[PDB]
Design an enzyme around this catalytic site. Structure first.
Site, short mmCIF file in Angstrom:
data_model
loop_
_atom_site.label_atom_id
_atom_site.label_comp_id
_atom_site.label_asym_id
_atom_site.label_seq_id
_atom_site.Cartn_x
_atom_site.Cartn_y
_atom_site.Cartn_z
N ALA A 7 5.23 1.54 -12.97
CA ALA A 7 5.83 2.77 -13.44
C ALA A 7 5.69 3.82 -12.34
CB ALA A 7 5.18 3.24 -14.76
N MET A 10 0.76 -1.26 0.00
CA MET A 10 0.00 0.00 0.00
C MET A 10 0.80 1.31 0.00
SD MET A 10 -3.11 -0.56 -0.54
CE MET A 10 -3.05 -2.20 -1.35
N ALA A 43 -9.59 -14.35 -9.21
CA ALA A 43 -8.93 -14.15 -10.50
C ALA A 43 -7.48 -13.70 -10.33
CB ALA A 43 -9.71 -13.17 -11.37
N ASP A 57 4.07 6.60 -12.43
CA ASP A 57 2.67 6.92 -12.35
C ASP A 57 1.90 5.73 -11.80
OD1 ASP A 57 2.71 9.62 -13.82
OD2 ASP A 57 0.59 9.17 -13.76
N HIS A 115 -3.42 -5.36 -9.47
CA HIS A 115 -4.40 -4.29 -9.21
C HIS A 115 -5.83 -4.79 -9.47
CE1 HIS A 115 -6.18 -0.28 -8.94
NE2 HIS A 115 -6.90 -0.66 -9.99
N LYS A 140 -10.39 -11.47 -6.16
CA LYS A 140 -9.21 -12.13 -5.59
C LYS A 140 -9.01 -13.52 -6.21
CE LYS A 140 -8.63 -9.90 -1.00
NZ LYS A 140 -8.31 -10.16 0.46
N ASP A 142 -0.54 2.90 -10.86
CA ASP A 142 -1.48 2.04 -11.60
C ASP A 142 -1.52 2.34 -13.08
OD1 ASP A 142 -2.23 0.56 -9.43
OD2 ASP A 142 -3.87 1.85 -8.84
N1 LIG Z 1 3.84 1.31 -5.15
C1 LIG Z 1 3.73 1.96 -6.37
N2 LIG Z 1 4.57 3.10 -6.68
C2 LIG Z 1 4.57 3.77 -7.82
N3 LIG Z 1 5.29 4.90 -7.91
N4 LIG Z 1 3.74 3.39 -8.85
C3 LIG Z 1 2.80 2.13 -8.51
O1 LIG Z 1 2.19 1.94 -9.76
C4 LIG Z 1 2.77 1.45 -7.35
C5 LIG Z 1 1.73 0.40 -7.45
C6 LIG Z 1 0.58 1.15 -6.70
C7 LIG Z 1 -0.45 -0.10 -6.30
C8 LIG Z 1 -1.79 0.39 -5.72
C9 LIG Z 1 -1.87 1.81 -4.93
C10 LIG Z 1 -2.45 3.18 -5.33
C11 LIG Z 1 -2.46 4.19 -4.32
C12 LIG Z 1 -1.91 3.89 -2.96
C13 LIG Z 1 -1.84 4.98 -2.02
O2 LIG Z 1 -2.53 5.97 -2.18
N5 LIG Z 1 -1.04 4.77 -0.91
C14 LIG Z 1 -0.88 5.83 0.15
C15 LIG Z 1 -1.34 5.19 1.41
C16 LIG Z 1 -2.83 4.87 1.40
C17 LIG Z 1 -3.30 4.18 2.62
O3 LIG Z 1 -2.61 4.01 3.63
O4 LIG Z 1 -4.55 3.82 2.44
C18 LIG Z 1 0.60 6.38 0.19
O5 LIG Z 1 0.76 7.50 0.64
O6 LIG Z 1 1.66 5.63 -0.25
C19 LIG Z 1 -1.36 2.54 -2.60
C20 LIG Z 1 -1.35 1.55 -3.59
C21 LIG Z 1 -2.93 -0.47 -6.37
O7 LIG Z 1 -4.09 0.59 -6.49
O8 LIG Z 1 -2.83 -0.94 -7.47
C22 LIG Z 1 -3.55 -1.23 -5.21
F1 LIG Z 1 -4.55 -1.99 -5.62
F2 LIG Z 1 -2.45 -1.89 -4.88
F3 LIG Z 1 -3.85 -0.54 -4.05
#
Ligand SMILES: NC1N[C@H](N)NC(=O)C1CCC[C@@H](c1ccc(C(=O)N[C@@H](CCC(=O)O)C(=O)O)cc1)C(O)(O)C(F)(F)F
Length: 200
Positions: free
Chosen positions: A140, A89, A172, A142, A108, A170, A144
């Site tokens: 990446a 997260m 899937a 950016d 995701h 889940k 998701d």
């Molecule tokens: N870790 C990554 N880093 C970068 N730069 N790019 C990515 O594509 C990553 C994959 C992101 C995976 C997901 C995602 C999208 C948003 C968050 C987010 O807002 N995190 C917050 C903490 C939020 C919290 O504590 O609820 C914070 O402040 O970090 C957390 C996870 C997901 O929406 O796909 C899911 F499903 F995993 F949640």
């Protein structure tokens, strides 16, 4: 390939990855499981499987770059080839993502590019889709928005809650995430130089 799994919770995706990497002819082995949160069930699943764990508490770091470096040290310590984000997260910083470009996967719970973000199901129900699904993608900068490796459609049922829809999806995830890891670990699927997905 030597694999790290990062988690923040229950670890059902982790579990499915553990089981699949231990099927014969697997191109991957999970060598470390890292959580940013203490006392999550994913840690127990890792230890019950005989896989080492670390908790790296994100709240103990001044910024994301430093938290990401603490993770990176462990990944080096364990000679990691590929990183799997499985209910992890924390958004990762630029240089960490760049370092791991083409080697880091995320699961995701929507059909990207619909419903980016951590509350995909809440968005799917609000919007009124009858079909949602899940996506494995390269990570990446950016959120998701990395290159798509595999997807699977899942029906939304009339009267679904976040909980019921989440459980169906889940099911899937536990199929495509292990399949996508095998694809990358075997070099069948690569992130190409042109920034696009490549199948050999
Ligand atoms: N870790 C990554 N880093 C970068 N730069 N790019 C990515 O594509 C990553 C994959 C992101 C995976 C997901 C995602 C999208 C948003 C968050 C987010 O807002 N995190 C917050 C903490 C939020 C919290 O504590 O609820 C914070 O402040 O970090 C957390 C996870 C997901 O929406 O796909 C899911 F499903 F995993 F949640």
């Amino acid at each position: 390939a030597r694999v790290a799994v990062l988690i923040s919770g229950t670890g059902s995706n982790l579990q499915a990855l553990i089981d699949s990497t231990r099927e014969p002819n697997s191109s991957a082995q999970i060598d470390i499981v890292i959580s940013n949160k203490a006392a999550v069930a994913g840690l127990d699943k890792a230890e019950r499987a005989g896989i080492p764990t670390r908790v790296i508490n994100h709240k103990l770091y001044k910024n994301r770059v430093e938290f990401d470096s603490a993770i990176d040290l462990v990944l080096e310590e364990f000679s990691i080839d590929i990183v799997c984000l499985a209910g992890f997260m924390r958004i990762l910083s630029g240089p960490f993502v760049q370092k791991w470009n083409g080697k880091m996967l995320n699961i995701h719970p929507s059909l990207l590019p619909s419903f980016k973000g951590s509350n995909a199901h809440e968005q799917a129900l609000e919007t009124g889709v009858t079909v949602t699904g899940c996506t494995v993608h390269f990570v990446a900068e950016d959120v998701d928005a990395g290159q798509i490796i595999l997807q699977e459609a899942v029906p939304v049922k009339r009267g679904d809650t976040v909980a019921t829809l989440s459980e169906r999806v889940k099911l899937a995830e536990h199929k495509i995430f292990p399949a996508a890891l095998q694809l990358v670990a075997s070099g069948t699927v690569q992130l190409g130089e042109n920034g696009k997905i490549c199948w050999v």
